[PDB]
Amino acid sequence: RKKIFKPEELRQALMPTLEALYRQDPESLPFRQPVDPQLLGIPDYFDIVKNPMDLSTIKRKLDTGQYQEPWQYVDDVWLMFNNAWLYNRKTSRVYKFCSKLAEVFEQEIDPVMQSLG
């Protein structure tokens, strides 16, 4: 049945899944803040990645009630992953670290989504 989710319900359910990503070391570090192409020396980045996303931005959106439904949060986490797999070479640390975060996220999000429905 279709359903209305309160901002605090989503925060309580979903913030632990986000913290599970932030706990990963070494893999979470490049995902903690928005990519800064100038600092990183990669001026092509915003030419390739049209809709940047990162953990800090997702955390803020959860804290400020910007998700109405859990799939919107899942979509942002996957936008972050897809951006990293699009831009980075397959041998790079960021690409392989992304793959690890996707494994962790898949494990954490499943029982939480069952709980929200």
Ligand X SMILES: Cc1cc(-c2ccc3nc(C4CCOCC4)n(CCOC(F)(F)F)c3c2)cn(C)c1=O
- Our CB check for ligand X shows the closer of 13 and 97 to be 97
Binder among 67, 73, 87, 105 for ligand X (CB under 6 A):
87
- 59 near 18, Cβ under 8 Å? yes
Binding of residue 86 to ligand X (CB under 6 A): no
Distance between CA atoms of 107 and 93, rounded to whole angstroms? 21
The pattern of x and - marking residues 33 through 72 that bind ligand X according to CB under 6 A reads --x----x-x------------------------------
- 17 near 105, Cβ under 8 Å? yes
Task: Look at the block and give the residue holding tokens 């940047």.
Answer: 52
Binder among 29, 56, 64, 103 for ligand X (CB under 6 A):
29
Distance between CA atoms of 19 and 28, rounded to whole angstroms? 10
Binding of residue 94 to ligand X (CB under 6 A): yes
- Our CB check for ligand X shows the closer of 30 and 70 to be 30
Running DSSP on this structure, what letter comes out for residue 12? Answer: H
